[PDB]
Amino acid sequence: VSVITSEMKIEVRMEGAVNGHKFVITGKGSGQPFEGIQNVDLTVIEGGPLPFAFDILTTAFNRVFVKYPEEIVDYFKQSFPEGYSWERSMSYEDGGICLATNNITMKKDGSNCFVNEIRFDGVNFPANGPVMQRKTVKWESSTEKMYVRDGVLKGDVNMALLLQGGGHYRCDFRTTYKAKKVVQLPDYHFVDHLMEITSHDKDYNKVKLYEHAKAHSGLPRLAK
Amino acid sequence: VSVITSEMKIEVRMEGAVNGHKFVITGKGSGQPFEGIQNVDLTVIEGGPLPFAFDILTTAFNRVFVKYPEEIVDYFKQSFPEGYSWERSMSYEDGGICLATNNITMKKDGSNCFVNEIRFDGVNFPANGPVMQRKTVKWESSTEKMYVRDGVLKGDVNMALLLQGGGHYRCDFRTTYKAKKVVQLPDYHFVDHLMEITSHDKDYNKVKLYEHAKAHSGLPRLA
Numbered sequence: 001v002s003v004i005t006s007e008m009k010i011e012v013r014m015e016g017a018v019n020g021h022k023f024v025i026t027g028k029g030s031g032q033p034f035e036g037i038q039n040v041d042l043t044v045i046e047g048g049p050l051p052f053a054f055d056i057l058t059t060a061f062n063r064v065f066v067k068y069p070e071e072i073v074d075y076f077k078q079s080f081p082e083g084y085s086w087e088r089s090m091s092y093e094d095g096g097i098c099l100a101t102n103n104i105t106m107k108k109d110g111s112n113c114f115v116n117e118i119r120f121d122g123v124n125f126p127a128n129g130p131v132m133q134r135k136t137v138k139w140e141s142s143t144e145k146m147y148v149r150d151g152v153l154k155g156d157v158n159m160a161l162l163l164q165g166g167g168h169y170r171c172d173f174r175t176t177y178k179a180k181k182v183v184q185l186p187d188y189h190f191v192d193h194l195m196e197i198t199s200h201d202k203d204y205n206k207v208k209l210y211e212h213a214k215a216h217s218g219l220p221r222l223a224k
Numbered sequence: 225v226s227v228i229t230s231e232m233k234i235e236v237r238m239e240g241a242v243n244g245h246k247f248v249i250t251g252k253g254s255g256q257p258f259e260g261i262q263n264v265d266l267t268v269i270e271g272g273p274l275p276f277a278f279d280i281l282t283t284a285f286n287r288v289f290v291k292y293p294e295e296i297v298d299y300f301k302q303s304f305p306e307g308y309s310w311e312r313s314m315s316y317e318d319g320g321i322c323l324a325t326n327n328i329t330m331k332k333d334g335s336n337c338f339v340n341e342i343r344f345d346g347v348n349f350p351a352n353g354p355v356m357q358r359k360t361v362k363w364e365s366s367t368e369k370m371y372v373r374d375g376v377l378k379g380d381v382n383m384a385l386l387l388q389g390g391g392h393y394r395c396d397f398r399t400t401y402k403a404k405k406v407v408q409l410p411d412y413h414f415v416d417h418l419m420e421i422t423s424h425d426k427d428y429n430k431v432k433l434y435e436h437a438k439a440h441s442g443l444p445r446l447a
C-alpha cells in the first residue's frame with residue numbers, strides 16, 4: 001500500500017566538500033509524485049560563494065518524483081513512509097569525480113513531507129576545468145537505465161553538461177537505490193529526466209531547481 | 225630550504241562515511257621522513273564497530289614519509305612548514321569507490337609534528353562484496369607512478385587487496401598532490417610502498433599501522 005499523495009513537501013540539507021572546499025546547503029520545496037515534477041529553493045549557508053560550478057550538485061537535490069505507468073513497478077513510492085536511501089558515483093571525463101548519498105524518509109506527522117539528508121564529496125577536478133572555472137551552462141536531459149542487482153535497484157545514466165564555450169562535458173552516473181523495507185522489484189526500465197536551475201543569484205548562494213521525470217519501457221517493437 | 229627533521233610526530237583525525245555509515249577516527253604516531261618509515265595508532269571514536277573492511281581506510285592515514293634519492297626532486301619535503309593537501313579517488317573493480325582528502329601542515333610550536341585533517345567517503349560497495357563482508361587480508365606492496373600535471377603532482381597506483389578466500393581485489397588509485405606554496409617540480413618517477421596493519425583489536429576499533437616507502441627512477445637501462 002502506498003501512502004504517497006499528489007502534493008508533498010520537500011526539506012533538504014546537504015553537507016559536503018569539493019576539492020577540499022567545505023559547504024552546507026539547505027532548502028525547501030514541493031513536488032507532485034504522480035506527475036513526476038518537483039521544485040526546490042536552495043540556500044548556501046556555509047562555504048559561499050562556492051568556487052565550483054553549482055551544476056555538479058543539482059542532481060543530488062528523489063526518484064519518488066517520477067510519473068510511473070501502471071505497467072511498471074514503482075520501487076520508490078512503495079518504500080514509504082519508511083523510505084529509501086541512495087548512493088551515487090558521478091565520474092567526469094576529465095578525471096573529476098563526485099560521490100553523494102541521500103537518506104530519505106517521510107515525516108511522522110501527516111505533513112506529507114520528505115526529509116533528505118545529503119552528503120556530497122568531489123575531488124580531482126582540474127583547476128582549469130569547466131567545474132572549477134564555472135563554465136557550465138546546464139545538464140542536458142537524460143534517460144536513466146534502471147535494473148535490479150542483488151535485491152536492490154541500480155540506475156545508470158550518461159549525463160552531459162553543456163559548456164559556455166559550446167560543446168559538452170560528460171559524466172557517468174552510477175546510482176544504487178536501497179529501500180528501507182521489502183518492496184516489489186521492477187523489471188528493467190527507464191526514467192527520462194529533464195532538470196534545470198530556474199533561478200539563481202550572482203554567486204549561486206540562492207538557487208531554484210525544477211525537474212520533470214517519467215518512467216517508461218523504451219521504444220515499441222513496431223514502428224508507428 | 226627544508227625544515228624536515230629525522231624524527232617527527234603525526235596527529236590525524238578522519239571523518240567519513242562508507243555506504244552511508246558515519247564514523248570518526250583519531251590517531252597519533254611518528255615517522256622518519258628521511259628513512260621513509262612511519263607508524264600510527266588509530267582509535268575509532270564514533271561509528272564503531274565499523275561494518276566495512278578497515279583496510280579501505282589505511283592509505284588515507286603522507287608522502288613526506290618517503291626516502292627520496294638525492295637525484296630526485298622531493299615535492300613533499302619542500303612544501304613544509306606550510307605543507308600540502310591531497311585528493312584521491314580509489315576505484316574498486318566491483319564498482320565500489322572511495323574519495324578522500326588530507327590537508328597536512330606542521331605545527332608552528334617547534335614540536336616537529338604533522339597535523340592531518342582527513343575526509344573519507346565511499347559508496348556502491350556490494351552488500352556481498354569483500355569490503356562489506358570484511359574478507360580482506362591486506363594491501364599488497366605497490367609502486368606509485370608520479371608525474372606532474374598542470375603545475376601540481378599526480379600519483380597513480382595499481383593497488384590490490386589480498387582476500388581471505390584467496391585471490392585479489394583490485395583498486396585503482398588516482399591522487400593529486402598540491403603544495404601550499406611554490407616548490408620545484410619533479411620529473412616522472414616512482415614511489416614503492418609497503419604498508420600494513422601491525423595490530424588491531426577484534427572489531428578494529430584500535431588499529432596500528434606501519435609504512436615503508438622509497439622513491440626511485442625505475443629499472444636501469446642496462447642489465
Ligand SMILES: [Mg+2]
Nearest residue numbers: 136137138197
Ligand atoms: Mg548558469
Ligand SMILES: [Mg+2]
Nearest residue numbers: 360361362421
Ligand atoms: Mg586483518
Ligand code: NA
Nearest residue numbers: 072073186187
Ligand atoms: Na516492472
Ligand code: NA
Nearest residue numbers: 296297410411
Ligand atoms: Na626530479
